[PDB]
Design a protein around this ligand. Structure first.
Ligand SMILES: Nc1cc(S(N)(=O)=O)ccc1O
Ligand SMILES: Nc1cc(S(N)(=O)=O)ccc1O
Ligand SMILES: Nc1cc(S(N)(=O)=O)ccc1O
Ligand SMILES: Nc1cc(S(N)(=O)=O)ccc1O
Lengths: 1724, 263
C-alpha cells in the first residue's frame, strides 16, 4: 500500500529500562514520607504473606513422580510456589510464565521443568538418553550463568546430566556442546549461535528454553529476547517439532502481554504471585536527595550511609552496593574513618570475641592492601578485580558473620549466594561507556541487589535502603512495588534484528518481515497500548491488526539496510536479497552502520595506521567523546603510541585508537572515564577485527589479511609481534623473557642450540633446559610441495604439512588451527585459502592438502604458501614455490572436425532385423554417429569416440556389436561402464534390442563368480562394471571365455582420471595384453567425454589416428547453452539462500514452459528447493504454471506416496528425488516428469548417474557437498558436473539444451576452463598398485621385478609419464628417468606386499605368491584387509570377534550421512548380543559393525540406511570366506566352523538361536513357540508333518504355505557317504585319502532362497576333516553341488596313535543343514 | 613579558610519525611512473625494468630517506643488446636523503648464479639533472671491490619523487667516472674533481610483459634506518626468496613497540 518512511529515532524509548510508562504510583498501605535537610525519605513497611488460603499444602517430595524425586534429594517438601506450580511444570508441557518477587523460587520451578524434560528420555535401563535432547537456560548476566552451571550440575549429577556454559572460542566448544545436555548462556550468546545457519547444528535437539529474568524485555538488551523467542516460535511452525518455553519474571505490569508473547495459555500456564510472597519480608527505605551541587550531594550521601549503618552497627550486617571497583574501597574507608572520628568503631567489633583475631590474622596474611587497611575494623570490600582466594576470603568471612560492613559491586549480587540482613544501594548513577555518560542503574541490577536483603533462614525481616536523587523516587518505587510496566525496546534494534532474519532465510520479503514482527513483544504492546508507540487510537481503529504500521516499520528498516549495502531491497516487489556484508554483520554481531563504514573505507592498500583508524570509526563507539579532563593523559599517550594517529586529540576516533593501542601495550591509565572506555572498546575489538579479517580474506587482499589477522592476535594476546613469542607461555617468568628480548637475537636462532647453548646465549644458564622445552613446544610446521600441472594454465598443488614441534595438551589443548594462504608473485592476491586444523590425535602425522591455482605464460617466478597460526603470534611458515623447473604439458591438439556429411539413414545398416531396432524411434542418425559409422561398422580397427554426454556414443557401440553379430554367430562382446546405475539402464535397453528383438543373449554381471562365468559363456552381450570384470579377467590364463572375446567396449573411459579409475585402466590394459598374446585380436571401442589428451588414450588402446574421433564440446548435436553464475558468499547455507530466487528466475528465463531438472547438494535441499520454487511461483506473474495435467489425473499417483509434502509439491507441478525415497515413489515421480505432467524436478547430486529422465534446462544449485566423515565441504567431481550438464538434452523435442551452473565465485574460473574445453585426464594407478600386482603374482604374470616394469609399460600411467612428467613426480622424460621411476614404484609396491606376507622375494629378484596373497586375489579383497585379518584373528576367536574383525576391513569406508544415527546406535548397541570395547561414531566401520547386528536380529528399518545395509551385505560373504580360509590354512578348526556358520547367519538373517524355523517364510516367534510346543524344531520336521496337522499348527494363508513349501523344496536334503581308502593299510606320514559322495535327492534348479539377502546366491559347501578338543583342522575342500557330486580329501598321518576324527559338512547359506559324521582311523 | 604567569608546556611532535603517515600514501605514485627519455642514439644497452617490482620498491620506500636495491638480470635469448631486469635484491641498509649505506658484501645466493649483476636502483627525494657524486663514488667503489661489476654493463636507476609521481632515469659510469669515484673521499655535495663526463644516460623501459621478483635477508629484514647502530659495513647476511616489508613495518622499528609498552 502507499507506505510511509518512519523515523525510528523518534519512536525509541531513549531511557531504556529507565522508561516509566505509568503516570501515577500508589504505595502499600502504611507507607510514609519524612523530610530532612537536603533529602526526603519514603518508608514502605514489610508486606504480610497471604495466610495459606486455598488449603494449599507443601507437596512432599514423596508425592512427586518417582523419576523427579532424585532432583529433590535432601529436601522434605517443595516450597510454596513450587507446590502451586508442580502440576503445570511436571505433569504438562504448557508454556509457562511465572511472575514472583525476586527470591520466591522461580529457578526451582525451572528445575522442575527441566526434570520433566529429562524424564522424557529415561529408558528401562534406568540411564538417560543424554544424546537425544538439549535444554537452553538463558540468564542475563555471565556471573549468574556460572553460578547456575554450578547449582544445576550439582542437583542433576545423579542423572548423568552435564551442565555447562558456552565459552568464547568456537571449535572446541561445539565438541563440548555435543556432550552438554543443559547449555547455560546469555541472550546475546544464544542469539549469535542461532544466527549462524549450519544444518549440523545441535540446536535441532533443543526441547526446552528457560528465559530467566524475562523483565529484561524492558532493558535495552530486551530486543535480543524478542528475536530469540520469535525465531524459536516461527521455527516450531517451520519444523512442527515443539519447544517448551518457560519465562521467569519479576512482578511488574504487562505480564499478561509477556505471556501472550510466549504463547502461554493464561488459563493454563500463567502464574502471578505478588511481593508478599517474598520469602523474607522487606522493609524498604527510599532516600531521595535534593542537593544539586556535586560537593554537597556527595557529602550528604556519605552522611546518610553513616547514619543508616549506625542504626545497624553491632546488630546487623550491612551490604552496601556501590558503582565502581575503586568506589568499594573509597566508600568503606569513608565509613570507617567517620566511625573512627566519632569513637564508634567499637560497635562493630566486640573486643572480647575471636572474630577480631580472625580478622587481624586473615588481614595480615592477605594480598590486598585495601583489605589490609579494612579487615581489622570489620569493613570488607568485594569486587571483580580481586583474587579468587581473596573473594572467597570475604565470602566465607561474611557468611561466618565476621564482617559487619561489606561494600561490594554488582557482580557479587549476581554471582554469589550472599544475603545480608541489611542492604544499602549507595547512589543509582553508573557510568555507561556505550551511552558515553552517566545513567541510572538497570532495573535488573536494582531488583537483584535489593533481593539480597534478608537471610532466608537467619532473619525474620530484611531492610533495603536505596539512596538516589529525589526526581527518581517514583521510578524506584514503581520498580519495587509491582508498578513499572514492562515495555518493548524493539524499535531501537529493528534494522539489526531484521537483517539477522534475512540472513537466516527466515525473512525473504517485506510480507515475511511483517509476519515475523507479529511474534515480537513490540507487536503485542503496540496492539494493547498503541499511543505509547506513536499510534493514534484512530490509527488503530483504521488498522486493527496493525498491518500497515508493521509494513511501514519494515519498509523503513529495509531501506536503512539497503542504504548500507547489507540487503538489496526491491521496493516494488518487497523482496530482500542477502549479501556477504549483511551476513558478516549478523554473524559477527555488528551493527549495520559499522559494516557500511568498513565497506566504505577498507582498501587492499590500507596500512596499520588506517586500519586502526577504520576500527576506531565503528558505530559501537559512536557516543564516545573526549572529555577535557582526559585530554592531558591522552596527549601523553598520543605522542608515543607505536602506530601514528593522523587526526587530532579533539576527535573521538583518536581517543578510541589510542585506547586500543594502550590496551595491547598493557598500559595503566589513570582517568576513570578513560579506563572504563578502554574496557568497552577492547571488549568488542576482537570480534569487530575478526569481521574485518573475514571481509578482506574472502576478497583475496593478501597484505591486509596479514595485517588484520595479526591485529586480532595482538588484541587477544595483549602484545605486539615485536615481543618475544615466548611470552605466550604464561608459565614462563617475565624476567627471563625480558632478558631474552634484551639480548636481541632472532627467535629462530634458538632452534640450533642444545639446552646448554641456550642458557649460555641468554647470559644465564640455569634456564637452558626449560627454555629448550618451551622452544620446541611452540607450534611449527614444515612444508613441501609436489606441483602437478593440469594444463598450461591450471596447476594442482599437493602440500605436505609435517608438524615439527612437541605436542603438550596443557598448552595446545586438543587442536591447533592455521590458515593456508597461496599468494601470487607480489604477495598481493590470495589465489587460494583454506582453514587447517591439526588435531592432537594426528600431532605427529603428515597432512596432505590439495588445491588448484591458475598459472600463465610467461610463467611467473614464484608463488608463496603461507601457513599461519590462527591464534599464536609469530607463528608462520612460508614456502616459496618456484616455477624455474616446472614442465608444462604440451598444449592440446585441435579436435577432430565434424565433417557435415549427409545425415545417415538407418538404411545404411543394410539389414531389416538390424534396422528394426531404430526405425520407430528416428529416421536418421546424428552427425557424430554419421561420422563414425564407416569406421565402427565397416572395419575392425580399434576406435575411440570422444564427445559430450548426450552425443549418442552408445549407438556407436551398438554399431560395433551389430558388426560382431554378422562376423560371428556366437560372438562375445563385453561392455564395461563405470557405474552400476548406468549398467542397469544399458542392460534394460540392450535386453530389449538384442534379446527381445534380435534373439541374442544379453547378461548383466552380478559379481558372484560362479554365475558370472555362466553368463559369460552363454551371453553374446555381457554388461559389467569394472570390478566385476577385474575379478573375472584376472584368471584369463584358465578361462577361455575371457580370451574368446570378439569385442571389448568401454564406456565413460574419461573416468580413468577419477576416484575409481585404476581398476578401469587395469582391465583395459589387460585386454590389450591378452589380444597381443592370443594373436587373434580383441577389437576395442572406447567412448568418452571430450578429452584434450584423447590421442594418448587412443595410443594406449591401440587406436589409429584415422579411427580416433576426438570431438570438442561445441559439436554436441543438441546445441548446449551453458551459463555459469558466480555467487560471492563463502558461507554455504547463506550462499544457497541467495541462489533460491535466481533458481526461479532461471526457470522463467531459460525454460518457462519446458522441463527443468534442478540438482541440489543434499537430500534435505530437494524438498526445500521444491517448496521454495512453489512459494516464488505463487507470488509471481504465473501461478501453477508447472502443472500441465489436471488435478484429477494425478490422484492415483498421490495415493501410493508416503511423503505428504511430496504430494503437495507434486500437485503444484514440482517433484523431487533423493536417496530416502522408496524406489517406486521415485518411479512415480520420474514418469510424472516424463509424461510432462509436472514441469520441474529437484534431484539430489547423488542421483546424477541413476536418473532416467532428461530436461530442456538443468540448473546446478551449488557445486559442493558436506562430507560428514571429514566434517568439511567437498567440491563436486568434475565428472559429476559433466553428467549433470548432460541431462539438458532432448534430441527429439528441443532445438537446444540450457544449463545454468550456480557456484561460489571462487570456482567460476575452474568451470569455464574445464567445461568449455575438452578435459585432460591422468592416471592414478601409481596410487593403487598393490592389489593388482598381488593378483598378477598369483596369476604368474609377474614372476620377477623386470616383469612388473614390463607390465607397467602396458598402462595409461606409463604413456602419461612421458607427456606430463611433473604430474607423476618425474623431472625428465628420458629413457633412464622412466626406468628408474618404474623401478622405484615396483620396488616399493613389492616391498609392501612382502612385508604383509602376501608375496615372497628370493635373491631380491624373483617373487612368488604366498597364502595370504592368494586369498586376497581369489576373494578380491584389499591386501591390507587380509593382513589385518591375519593380525587380528586367533585360534579361538569368538563369533563376535569375527563380527568386528570383518567390520574393520578396508572395504567399509562409505557411510557418514548421520552421526546422530550412531548416537542413537549408542542405545541400539545395548540390545545387540555381541559385546566389545567402545562406541565411537563418525567412523564408517562402526556403522558397519552395528548395521550388521541389525541384519542378523532383523532389527527395524530405514530408507537410505537400508541401501547402506545392502552394500555391506554385497561384501560380507567374501570377507567371511577369506577368514575361513585363513583359519583353515593356519589349522585352527573351531573358529573356522564358527565363520562357516556366520556365513549362514548373514545369508538367512539369524543369530545362534538353535531354532532354524526362523528361516521359513511368514514365520513368527509364536509360530516357533507352537512348533516347539508340538515337537517341531527342524525344517525337516515341518515337512514331515501331515499337511493338515501343519496347517492347524501354523495359522496359514494359501500363498503363505506355498512360499513355505517353495523354501522346503529348495532346502538342501543331502545324503552323505564317506569312504576311507586303504582303511587298514596306512603308515604314519603317509596318504589318507578320503572320498566323500553327496546326493541332493529331490531336485535342484533354483538359487538359494534368502529374502533378507539382496544378491542372488548358489549353495556352497565345505567338507572339513578335523579333531575337536585339539582344534586340529586337517583337510578341507570347498564345493558347489548339483544333485550328485564326489570329492577327495588329502591328509598325511600324524602318528600311529590310532584314534578318532570328526567330519563336518557345512553350508555357507542355510542353517541346520550341517552334517557331522564321526570316523576313527587306526594307523595301518 | 610573562615568566610563570603566562606559562605554556612543550608537547613533543616526533618526525617519523609524519613520515610514516605520508609513506602510507606511496601507492598513489605507482599509477604515475615516468621514465625520462632524454637519452639518444639507442647506442648502448637497453634496460627493461618490470613494473611489478618497481611498484613494490616504491611502496616499501620513504619520502626522505633513500633506499636501494641490487639489480640482477639477463639478455633475452637472441637480443644481447637488451638487459632484462629479473630480480631486485634488498640487503640490510640505512640511508639519508643524499645517499645509501650498504654492506661491502654483495648478494650471494644459488638462485642468483645464472643472472648477471646489472647495478642498483635507489629512491631520491627530488629530481636532479646530473647524477649524484655520491652515486658515482658508490658505484665506483663497489666496482673496484667486485670485478663482476662490468663498468659497461652496470647502471644506476634513480627513482625521483616528484609531487604526484616518480620519475625514473638510468645512468652508467664512464671510465673517467670510475677512476674518479674510486679514489674519492669527500662525501659533500660538491667534492673535488667531480665532472659530468663521469656518467652517461642509458636507455630504460618499463614493461608489463614479464614479472620480476625480490630477494630479501634470511634472518633479519632489510631496513636498518631505525637500528643504524646494529648496522656495519662488514656485516654479513644470507638471502631468501620473499617480498620486502614496507619501510615503516613493525619489524623495522621494534623499539617503538617495546618502549611504548615500558611506558
Ligand atoms: N534449529 C533451530 C533452533 C532454534 S531454537 N530457539 O530452538 O534453539 C532456532 C532456530 C533454528 O534454526
Ligand atoms: N554411458 C552413456 C553415454 C551416453 S552419450 N549420449 O554421451 O553417448 C548416453 C548414455 C549412457 O549410459
Ligand atoms: N569477493 C568475495 C568473494 C567471495 S568467494 N567467491 O570466495 O565466496 C566471498 C566474499 C567476497 O567479498
Ligand atoms: N610531476 C608531477 C606530476 C603530476 S601527475 N602525473 O599526477 O598529474 C602531478 C604533479 C607533478 O609535480
Amino acid at each position: 500500500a502507499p507506505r510511509q518512511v518512519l523515523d525510528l529515532e523518534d519512536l525509541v524509548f531513549t531511557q531504556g529500562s529507565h522508561f516509566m510508562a505509568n503516570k501515577r504510583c500508589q504505595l502499600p498501605d502504611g507507607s510514609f514520607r519524612r523530610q530532612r535537610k537536603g533529602y526526603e525519605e519514603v518508608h514502605v513497611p514489610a508486606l504480610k504473606p497471604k495466610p495459606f488460603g486455598s488449603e494449599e499444602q507443601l507437596l512432599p517430595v514423596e508425592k512427586l513422580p518417582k523419576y523427579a524425586q532424585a532432583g529433590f534429594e535432601g529436601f522434605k517438601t517443595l516450597n510454596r510456589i513450587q507446590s502451586k506450580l508442580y502440576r503445570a511444570a511436571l505433569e504438562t508441557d504448557e508454556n509457562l510464565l511465572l511472575c514472583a518477587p525476586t527470591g520466591a523460587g522461580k529457578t526451582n520451578v525451572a528445575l522442575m521443568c527441566m526434570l520433566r524434560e529429562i524424564g522424557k528420555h529415561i529408558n528401562m535401563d534406568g540411564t538417560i538418553n543424554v544424546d537425544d535432547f538439549k535444554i537452553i537456560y538463558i540468564a542475563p548476566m555471565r556471573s549468574l550463568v556460572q553460578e547456575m552451571v554450578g547449582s544445576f550440575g550439582k542437583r542433576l549429577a545423579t542423572y548423568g546430566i552435564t551442565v555447562a556454559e558456552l565459552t568464547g572460542d568456537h571449535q572446541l566448544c561445539k565438541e563440548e556442546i555435543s556432550a552438554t545436555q543443559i547449555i547455560v548462556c546469555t541472550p546475546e550468546k544464544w542469539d549469535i549461535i542461532t544466527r549462524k545457519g549450519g544444518e549440523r547444528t545441535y540446536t535441532q535437539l533443543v526441547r526446552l528454553i528457560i528465559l530467566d529474568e524475562i523483565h529484561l524485555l524492558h532493558d535495552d538488551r530486551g530486543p535480543v529476547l524478542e528475536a530469540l523467542v520469535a525465531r524459536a516460535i516461527r521455527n516450531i511452525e517451520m519444523t512442527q517439532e515443539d519447544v517448551r518455553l518457560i519465562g521467569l519474571s519479576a512482578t511488574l505490569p504487562n505480564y499478561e502481554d509477556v505471556a501472550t508473547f510466549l504463547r502461554v495459555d493464561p488459563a493454563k500456564g500463567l502464574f502471578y504471585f505478588d511481593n508478599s510472597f517474598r520469602p523474607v519480608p522487606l522493609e524498604q527505605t527510599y532516600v531521595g536527595i535534593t542537593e544539586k551541587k556535586a560537593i554537597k550531594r556527595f557529602q550528604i550521601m556519605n552522611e546518610i550511609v553513616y547514619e543508616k549503618i549506625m542504626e545497624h552497627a553491632g546488630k546487623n550486617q550491612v551490604l552496601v552496593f556501590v558503582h565502581s571497583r575503586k568506589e568499594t574501597g573509597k566508600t568503606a574507608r569513608a565509613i570507617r574513618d567517620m566511625c573512627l572520628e566519632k569513637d564508634t568503631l567499637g560497635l562493630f567489633l566486640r573486643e572480647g570475641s575471636a572474630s577480631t583475631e580472625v580478622l587481624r590474622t586473615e588481614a595480615e596474611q592477605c594480598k590486598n592492601l585495601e583489605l589490609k587497611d579494612l579487615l581489622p575494623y570489620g569493613f570488607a570490600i568485594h569486587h571483580a578485580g580481586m583474587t579468587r582466594v581473596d573473594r572467597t576470603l570475604v565470602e566465607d568471612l561474611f557468611a561466618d558473620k565476621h564482617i559487619q560492613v561489606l561494600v561490594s559491586t554488582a557482580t557479587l549480587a549476581w554471582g554469589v549466594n550472599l544475603p545480608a540482613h541489611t542492604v544499602i544501594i549507595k547512589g543509582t548513577q553508573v557510568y555507561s561507556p556505550e551511552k558515553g555518560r552517566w545513567t541510572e542503574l538497570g532495573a535488573l541490577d536494582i531488583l537483584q541487589m535489593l533481593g539480597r536483603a534478608g537471610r532466608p533462614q537467619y532473619d525474620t525481616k530484611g531492610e533495603g535502603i536505596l539512596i538516589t536523587s529525589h526526581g527518581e523516587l517514583q521510578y524506584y518505587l514503581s520498580l519495587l512495588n509491582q508498578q513499572l510496566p514492562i515495555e518493548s525496546q524493539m524499535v531501537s534494534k529493528l534494522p539489526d534484528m531484521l537483517n539477522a532474519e534475512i540472513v537466516l532465510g527466515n525473512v525473504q520479503n517485506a510480507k515475511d518481515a511483517v509476519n515475523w514482527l507479529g511474534y515480537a513483544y513490540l507487536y503485542i504492546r503496540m496492539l494493547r497500548s498503541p499511543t505509547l508507540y506513536g499510534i493514534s487510537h484512530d490509527d488503530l481503529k483504521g488498522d486493527p491488526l496493525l498491518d500497515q504500521r508493521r509494513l511501514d516499520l519494515v519498509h523503513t528498516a529495509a531501506l536503512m539496510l539497503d542504504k548500507n549495502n547489507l540487503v538489496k531491497y526491491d521496493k516494488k516487489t518487497g523482496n530482500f536479497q542477502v549479501t556477504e556484508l549483511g551476513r558478516i554483520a549478523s554473524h559477527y554481531y555488528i551493527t549495520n552502520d559499522t559494516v557500511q563504514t568498513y565497506n566504505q573505507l577498507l582498501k587492499p592498500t590500507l596500512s596499520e595506521i588506517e586500519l586502526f583508524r577504520v576500527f576506531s570509526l565503528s558505530s559501537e563507539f559512536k557516543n564516545i567523546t573526549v572529555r577535557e579532563e582526559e585530554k592531558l593523559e591522552l596527549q601523553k599517550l598520543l605522542e608515543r603510541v607505536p602506530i601514528p594517529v593522523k587526526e587530532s586529540i579533539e576527535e573521538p576516533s583518536a581517543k578510541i585508537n589510542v585506547l586500543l593501542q594502550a590496551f595491547i601495550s598493557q598500559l595503566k591509565l589513570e582517568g576513570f572515564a578513560l579506563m572504563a572506555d578502554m574496557v568497552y572498546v577492547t571488549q568488542s575489538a576482537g570480534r569487530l577485527m575478526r569481521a574485518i579479517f573475514e571481509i578482506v580474506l574472502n576478497r583475496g587482499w593478501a597484505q591486509l589479511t596479514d595485517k588484520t589477522l595479526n591485529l586480532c592476535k595482538m588484541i587477544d594476546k595483549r602484545m605486539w609481534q615485536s615481543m618475544c613469542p615466548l611470552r605466550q607461555f604464561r608459565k614462563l617468568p617475565e624476567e627471563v623473557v625480558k632478558k631474552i628480548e634484551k639480548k636481541n637475537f632472532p627467535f629462530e636462532r634458538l632452534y640450533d642450540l642444545n639446552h646448554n647453548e641456550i642458557g649460555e646465549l641468554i647470559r644465564m644458564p640455569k634456564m637452558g633446559k626449560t627454555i629448550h622445552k618451551y622452544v620446541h613446544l611452540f607450534p611449527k610446521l614444515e612444508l613441501s610441495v609436489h606441483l602437478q600441472p593440469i594444463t598450461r594454465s591450471t596447476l594442482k598443488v599437493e602440500l605436505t604439512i609435517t608438524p615439527d614441534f612437541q605436542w603438550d595438551e596443557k598448552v595446545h589443548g586438543s587442536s591447533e588451527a592455521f590458515w593456508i594462504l597461496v599468494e601470487d608473485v607480489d604477495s598481493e592476491v590470495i589465489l587460494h585459502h583454506e582453514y587447517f586444523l591439526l588435531k592432537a590425535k594426528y600431532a605427529q602425522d603428515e597432512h596432505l592438502i590439495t588445491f588448484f591455482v591458475p598459472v600463465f605464460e610467461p610463467l611467473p617466478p614464484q608463488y608463496f604458501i603461507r601457513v599461519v597460526s590462527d591464534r599464536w603470534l609469530s607463528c608462520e611458515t612460508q614456502l616459496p614455490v618456484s616455477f624455474r623447473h616446472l614442465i608444462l604439458p604440451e598444449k592440446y591438439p585441435p579436435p577432430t572436425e565434424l565433417l557435415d556429411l549427409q545425415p545417415l539413414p538407418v538404411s545404411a545398416l543394410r539389414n531389416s532385423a538390424f534396422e528394426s531396432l531404430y526405425q520407430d524411434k528416428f529416421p536418421f542418425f546424428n552427425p557424430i554417429q554419421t561420422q563414425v559409422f564407416n569406421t565402427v561398422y565397416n572395419s575392425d580397427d580399434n576406435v575411440f569416440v570422444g564427445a559430450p554426454t548426450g552425443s549418442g556414443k552408445t549407438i556407436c557401440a551398438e554399431f560395433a556389436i551389430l558388426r560382431m553379430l554378422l562376423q560371428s554367430s556366437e560372438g562375445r562382446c563385453v561392455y564395461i561402464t563405470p557405474m552400476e546405475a548406468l549398467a542397469e539402464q544399458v542392460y534394460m535397453d540392450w535386453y530389449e534390442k538384442f534379446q527381445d528383438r534380435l534373439n541374442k543373449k544379453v547378461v548383466l554381471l552380478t559379481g558372484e563368480t560362479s554365475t558370472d562365468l555362466k553368463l559369460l559363456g552363454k551371453g553374446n552381450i555381457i554388461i559389467s562394471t569394472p570390478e566385476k570384470w577385474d575379478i573375472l579377467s584376472r584368471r584369463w590364463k584358465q578361462r577361455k571365455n575371457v580370451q574368446n572375446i570378439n569385442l571389448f567396449v568401454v564406456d565413460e573411459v574419461h573416468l580413468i582420471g577419477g576416484e575409481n579409475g585404476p581398476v578401469l585402466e587395469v582391465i583395459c590394459s589387460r585386454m590389450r595384453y591378452i589380444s597381443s598374446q592370443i594373436e587373434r585380436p580383441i577389437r576395442i571401442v572406447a567412448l568418452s567425454s571430450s578429452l584434450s589428451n584423447a590421442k594418448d588414450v587412443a595410443h594406449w588402446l591401440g587406436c589409429s589416428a584415422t579411427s580416433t574421433f576426438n570431438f570438442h564440446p561445441n559439436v554436441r548435436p543438441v546445441p548446449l547453452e551453458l551459463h555459469i553464475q558466480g555467487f560471492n558468499i563463502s558461507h554455504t547455507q547463506t550462499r544457497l539462500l541467495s541462489m533460491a530466487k535466481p533458481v526461479y528466475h532461471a526457470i522463467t528465463k531459460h525454460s518457462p514452459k519446458k522441463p527443468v531438472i534442478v540438482f541440489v547438494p543434499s537430500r534435505k535441499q530437494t524438498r526445500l528447493t521444491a517448496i521454495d520454487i512453489l512459494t516464488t511461483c505463487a507470488a509471481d506473474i504465473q501461478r501453477q504454471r508447472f502443472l500441465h495435467c489436471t488435478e484429477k489425473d494425478l490422484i492415483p499417483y498421490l495415493e501410493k506416496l508416503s511423503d505428504s509434502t511430496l504430494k503437495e509439491t507434486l500437485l503444484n507441478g514440482v517433484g523431487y528425488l533423493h536417496e530416502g525415497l522408496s524406489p517406486m515413489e521415485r518411479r512415480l515421480v520420474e514418469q510424472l516428469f516424463s509424461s510432462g505432467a509436472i514441469q520441474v524436478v529437484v534431484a539430489s547430486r547423488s542421483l546424477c548417474w541413476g536418473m532416467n529422465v532428461a530436461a530442456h534446462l538443468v540448473i546446478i544449485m551449488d557445486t559442493q557437498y558436506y562430507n560428514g566423515k571429514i566434517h568439511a565441504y567437498v567440491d563436486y567431481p568434475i565428472y559429476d558436473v559433466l553428467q549433470m550438464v548432460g541431462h539438458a538434452n532432448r534430441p527429439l523435442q528441443d532445438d537446444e539444451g540450457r544449463c545454468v551452473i550456480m557456484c561460489q565465485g571462487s570456482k567460476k574460473d575452474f568451470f569455464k576452463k574445464f567445461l568449455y574445453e575438452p578435459l585432460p585426464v591422468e592416471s592414478h594407478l601409481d596410487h593403487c598398485m598393490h592389489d593388482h600386482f598381488n593378483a598378477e603374482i598369483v596369476t604368474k604374470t609377474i614372476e620377477n621385478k623386470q616383469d612388473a616394469v614390463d607390465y607397467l609399460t602396458w598402462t595409461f600411467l606409463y604413456r602419461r609419464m612421458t607427456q606430463n612428467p611433473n604430474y607423476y613426480n618425474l623431472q625428465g622424460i628420458s629413457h633412464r628417468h622412466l626406468s628408474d621411476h618404474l623401478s622405484e614404484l615396483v620396488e616399493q609396491t613389492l616391498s609392501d606386499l612382502e612385508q604383509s606376507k602376501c608375496i615372497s622375494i628370493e635373491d631380491e629378484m624373483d617373487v612368488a605368491p604366498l597364502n595370504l596373497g592368494m586369498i586376497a586375489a581369489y576373494y578380491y579383497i584389499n591386501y591390507t584387509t587380509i593382513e589385518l585379518f591375519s593380525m587380528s584373528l586367533n585360534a579361538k576367536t569368538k563369533v563376535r570377534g569375527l563380527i568386528e574383525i570383518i567390520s574393520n576391513a578396508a572395504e567399509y569406508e562409505n557411510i557418514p550421512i548421520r552421526h546422530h544415527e550412531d548416537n542413537l546406535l549408542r542405545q541400539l548397541a545395548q540390545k545387540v548380543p555381541h559385546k566389545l570395547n567402545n562406541p565411537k561414531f563418525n567412523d564408517p566401520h562402526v556403522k558397519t559393525n552395528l548395521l550388521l547386528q541389525a541384519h542378523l536380529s532383523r532389527m527395524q528399518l530405514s530408507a537410505e540406511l537400508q541401501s547402506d545395509t545392502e552394500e555391506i551385505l554385497s561384501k560380507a560373504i567374501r570377507l567371511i570366506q577369506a577368514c575361513v580360509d585363513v583359519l583353515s590354512s593356519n589349522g585352527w578348526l573351531s573358529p573356522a566352523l564358527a565363520a562357516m556358520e556366520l556365513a549362514q547367519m548373514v545369508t538367512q538373517a539369524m543369530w545362534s538361536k538353535d531354532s532354524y524355523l526362523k528361516q521359513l517364510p511368514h514365520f513368527t516367534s509364536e509360530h516357533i513357540k507352537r512348533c516347539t510346543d508340538k515337537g517341531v524344531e527342524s525344517v525337516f520336521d515341518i515337512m514331515e508333518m501331515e499337511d493338515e496337522e501343519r496347517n492347524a499348527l501354523l495359522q496359514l494363508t494359501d500363498s503363505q504355505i506355498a512360499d513355505v513349501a517353495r523354501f522346503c523344496n529348495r532346502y538342501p536334503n543331502i545324503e552323505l557317504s564317506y569312504e576311507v581308502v586303504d582303511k587298514d593299510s596306512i603308515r604314519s606320514g603317509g596318504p589318507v585319502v578320503v572320498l566323500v559322495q553327496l546326493e541332493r535327492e529331490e531336485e535342484v534348479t533354483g538359487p538359494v532362497i534368502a529374502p533378507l539377502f539382496p544378491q542372488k546366491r548358489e549353495e556352497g559347501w565345505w567338507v572339513v576333516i578335523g579333531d575337536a578338543k585339539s582344534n586340529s583342522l586337517i583337510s578341507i575342500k570347498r564345493l558347489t553341488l548339483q544333485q550328485k557330486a564326489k570329492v577327495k580329501l588329502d591328509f598325511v598321518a600324524p602318528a600311529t596313535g590310532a584314534h578318532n576324527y570328526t567330519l563336518y559338512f557345512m553350508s555357507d547359506a542355510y542353517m541346520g543343514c550341517d552334517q557331522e559324521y564321526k570316523f576313527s582311523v587306526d594307523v595301518k | 613579558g610573562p615568566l610563570g604567569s603566562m606559562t605554556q608546556t612543550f608537547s613533543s611532535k616526533t618526525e617519523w610519525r609524519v613520515r610514516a603517515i605520508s609513506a602510507a600514501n606511496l601507492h598513489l605514485r605507482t599509477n604515475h611512473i615516468y621514465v625520462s627519455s632524454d637519452d639518444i642514439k639507442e647506442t648502448g644497452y637497453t634496460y627493461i625494468l618490470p613494473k611489478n617490482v618497481l611498484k613494490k620498491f616504491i611502496c616499501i620506500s620513504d619520502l626522505r630517506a633513500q633506499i636501494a636495491g641490487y639489480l640482477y638480470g639477463v639478455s633475452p635469448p637472441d637480443n644481447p643488446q637488451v638487459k632484462e631486469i629479473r630480480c631486485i635484491v634488498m640487503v640490510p641498509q640505512w640511508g639519508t636523503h643524499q645517499t645509501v649505506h650498504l654492506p661491502g658484501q654483495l648478494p650471494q645466493h644459488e638462485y642468483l648464479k645464472e643472472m648477471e649483476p646489472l647495478g642498483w636502483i635507489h629512491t631520491q627525494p627530488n629530481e636532479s639533472p646530473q647524477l649524484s657524486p655520491q652515486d658515482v663514488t658508490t658505484h665506483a667503489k663497489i666496482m673496484a671491490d667486485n670485478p663482476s661489476w662490468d663498468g659497461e654493463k652496470t647502471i644506476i636507476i634513480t627513482c625521483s619523487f616528484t609531487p604526484g609521481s616518480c620519475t625514473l632515469t638510468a645512468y652508467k659510469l664512464t671510465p673517467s667516472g670510475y677512476e674518479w669515484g674510486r679514489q674519492n673521499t669527500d662525501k659533500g655535495n660538491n667534492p673535488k674533481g667531480y665532472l659530468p663526463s663521469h656518467y652517461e644516460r642509458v636507455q630504460m623501459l618499463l614493461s608489463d610483459r614479464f614479472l620480476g621478483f625480490f630477494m630479501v635477508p634470511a634472518q633479519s629484514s632489510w631496513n636498518y634506518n631505525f637500528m643504524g647502530v646494529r648496522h656495519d659495513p662488514n656485516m654479513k647476511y644470507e638471502l631468501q626468496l620473499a617480498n620486502p616489508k614496507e619501510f615503516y613495518h613493525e619489524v623495522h622499528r621494534p623499539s617503538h613497540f617495546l618502549n611504548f609498552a615500558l611506558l
